[PDB]
From Swiss-Prot, chain A:
Miscellaneous: Present with 35100 molecules/cell in log phase SD medium.
Residues of the full protein shown: 143 to 153 of 153
Name of the protein: Eukaryotic translation initiation factor 1A
Gene: TIF11
Highest rank taxon of the organism: Eukaryota
Record function comment: Seems to be required for maximal rate of protein biosynthesis. Enhances ribosome dissociation into subunits and stabilizes the binding of the initiator Met-tRNA(I) to 40 S ribosomal subunits.
Family label: Belongs to the eIF-1A family.
UniProtKB/Swiss-Prot annotation, chain B:
Region (G5) location: 192-194
Protein name: Eukaryotic translation initiation factor 5B
Catalytic activity: GTP + H2O = GDP + phosphate + H(+)
Keywords for this protein: Cytoplasm, GTP-binding, Hydrolase, Initiation factor, Magnesium, Metal-binding, Nucleotide-binding, Phosphoprotein, Potassium, Protein biosynthesis, Sodium
Part of the intact protein present: 402 to 1002 of 1002
Species the sequence originates in: Saccharomyces cerevisiae (strain ATCC 204508 / S288c)
EC number, UniProt record: 3.6.5.3
Residues bound to GTP: 14-19, 31-33, 124-127, 193-194
Length: 11, 590
């Protein structure tokens, strides 16, 4: 469901 | 009468490499020149040494003579100029006939096949052939024809095996006189450091591989940086082109920027053995190319071994030459991460550094900074900045460098692993081993601390306490054994938040079978979750927590961080990071 897109440094 | 060819002979002690060089020099009369950091062979002496080669080959003498550099270190250092500058016109690789290819020999091959540097192989120790009958200083072919078929057999066997072992390393090779193509093939010259047999052959072959297949500008290369009792810091150099004259303003690469100075002395060692207490070394107003020479000067203290050396001329701008010598390192310096997490690296020579950096690039070990020479608190401070960000990289990778007592004692306060050895392996094993040991400690701590996301819907309560057993539907994520389960409840007004830990999962049963894990979608059945009591009063079903309360894996700032390191590499799914995103919203974590 709107699969992208995220980082891993923000949290 | 252009410049002498330069020859680097390298081999392990066992191969007899040093005995070979001594036999090559063979003094017994102007004399052989034992120049600083190199031995010089005047063409005259070469002709004299190779007279016996007339039997077999056309002799040509189009060069003034020959320059040989003995050292394996300085062969590393001759490889220190490396790709940017080729220091030797050719290499003589020494191998023990009795022993074939040995670990080091393998490496030296790879090393030469890296610089694209041309080489010949001295197949040494032939005097140890079981029935060999020696003809001192003879050519090999002549001694060989005079040997018994027993020896002819033994030689063929060992030879053709070593030829084979070379093939296995990527090298086509042949006895020198038997090779159809010198290119894409390696010449093999049998020698004996003991009897001197075959030396004539070797000498001939060097001239043949250099004279035809292989000046005003000054080409100088820093071999070694040495403190001399009466001269402070000096540089030992090999001059390939031009002259060096006392007073000459030179430029060279230094560890704290370009160094400019003036030649106070050109020194070579003293010809008289008797002279050389009062005399020490000889001082020269000027010296020509093709010799190894010590330069005294001011400002050499932080000179970098492996540096090119330049003489500043009338029309030359100093500041642009200051740019030029540094270029070899500058190329190297720019590669590094700079402001990025990485291990710090330190080396003895420009080449040792380039080699180490190139090797690490292929492992894919990131590199925060590089350095040269003695290791100090300053240098080990570079690594300090990695203790919190990337502790695994809280290490120096040093090659062939002395470390300060102060700096080593300082690296003991903090947790700085200093790696120091001649070859990569020791660093690679220590470093790699240390990295795994670090994970070994990390994993044990991480597993308890770590926690995958999951959201569960209670279908019904099976056992309310002793132990609490809940029948659930996994809505999102991965419910697993060990995972702590909790309720998040906000009093309508007063409390505004909550965490009610029910327990950690002991066991999971779906469709009458134990399972260790259940991912959303794996089943439709519903799973009985047996929960180990948490320490301190377990919330009471009905009273505190009930059927309607969505329950989730207890995640926290610590929980989330522990996922990032060690755990992260394969275990987490993108779906699970996305779930974490949503969980923070529920738990009120930023």
């Amino acid at each position: 469901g709107e699969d992208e897109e995220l980082d891993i440094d923000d949290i | 009468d252009l410049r002498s060819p330069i020859c680097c002979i390298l081999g392990h002690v066992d191969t007899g490499k040093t005995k070979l060089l001594d036999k090559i020099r063979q003094t017994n009369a102007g004399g052989i020149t034992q120049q600083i950091g190199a031995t010089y062979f005047p063409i005259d002496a070469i002709k004299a040494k190779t007279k016996v080669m007339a039997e077999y080959e056309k002799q040509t003498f189009d060069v003034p003579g020959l320059l040989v550099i003995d050292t394996p270190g300085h062969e590393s250092f001759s490889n220190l100029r490396s790709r940017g500058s080729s220091l030797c016109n050719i290499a003589i690789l020494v191998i023990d006939i009795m022993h074939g290819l040995e670990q080091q020999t393998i490496e030296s091959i790879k090393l030469l096949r890296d610089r694209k540097a041309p080489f010949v192989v001295a197949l040494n120790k032939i005097d140890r052939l079981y029935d060999w009958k020696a003809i001192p200083n003879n050519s090999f072919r002549d001694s060989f024809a005079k040997q018994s078929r027993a020896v002819q057999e033994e030689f063929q066997s060992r030879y053709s095996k070593i030829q084979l072992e070379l093939a296995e390393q990527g090298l086509n090779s042949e006895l020198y006189f038997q090779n159809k193509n010198m290119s894409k093939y390696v010449s093999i010259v049998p020698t004996s450091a003991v009897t001197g047999e075959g030396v004539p052959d070797l000498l001939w072959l060097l001239l043949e591989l250099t004279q035809k297949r292989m000046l005003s500008h000054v080409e100088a290369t820093i071999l070694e940086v040495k403190v001399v009792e009466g001269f402070g810091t000096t540089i030992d150099v090999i001059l390939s082109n031009g002259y060096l004259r006392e007073g000459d303003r030179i430029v060279l690469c230094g560890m704290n920027g370009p160094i400019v100075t003036n030649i106070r002395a050109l020194l070579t060692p003293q010809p008289l053995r008797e002279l050389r207490l009062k005399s020490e070394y000889v001082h020269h107003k000027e010296v020509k190319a093709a010799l190894g020479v010590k330069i005294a000067a001011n400002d050499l203290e932080k000179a970098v071994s492996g540096s090119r050396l330049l003489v500043v001329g009338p029309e030359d701008d100093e500041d642009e030459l200051m740019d030029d010598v540094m270029d070899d390192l500058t190329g190297l310096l720019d590669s590094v991460d700079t402001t990025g997490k990485g291990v710090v690296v330190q080396a003895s020579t420009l080449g040792s550094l380039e080699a180490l950096l190139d090797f690490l690039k292929d492992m894919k070990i990131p590199v925060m900074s590089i350095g040269l020479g003695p290791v100090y608190k300053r240098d080990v401070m570079k690594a300090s900045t990695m203790l919190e960000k990337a502790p695994e990289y809280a290490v120096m990778l040093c090659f062939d460098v002395k470390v300060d007592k102060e700096a080593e004692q300082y690296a003991e306060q903090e947790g700085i692993k200093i790696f120091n050895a001649d070859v990569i392996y020791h660093l690679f094993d220590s470093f790699t081993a240390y990295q795994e040991k670090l994970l070994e400690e990390r994993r044990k701590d991480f597993l308890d601390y770590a926690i995958f996301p999951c959201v569960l819907q209670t279908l019904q309560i099976i056992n309310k306490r002793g132990p609490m057993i809940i029948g659930v539907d996994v809505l999102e994520g991965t419910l697993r054994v060990g995972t702590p389960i909790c309720a998040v409840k906000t009093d309508p007004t007063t409390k505004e938040r909550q965490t009610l830990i029910l327990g950690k999962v002991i066991s999971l049963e779906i469709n009458h079978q134990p399972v260790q894990e259940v991912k959303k979608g794996q089943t439709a059945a519903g799973v009985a979750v047996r929960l180990e009591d948490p320490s301190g009063q377990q919330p009471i079903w009905g009273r505190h927590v009930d059927e309607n309360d969505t329950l989730y894996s207890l995640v926290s700032r610590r929980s989330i961080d522990t996922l990032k390191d060690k755990a992260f590499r394969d275990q987490v799914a993108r779906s699970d990071w996305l779930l974490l995103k949503k969980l923070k919203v529920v738990f009120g974590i930023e």
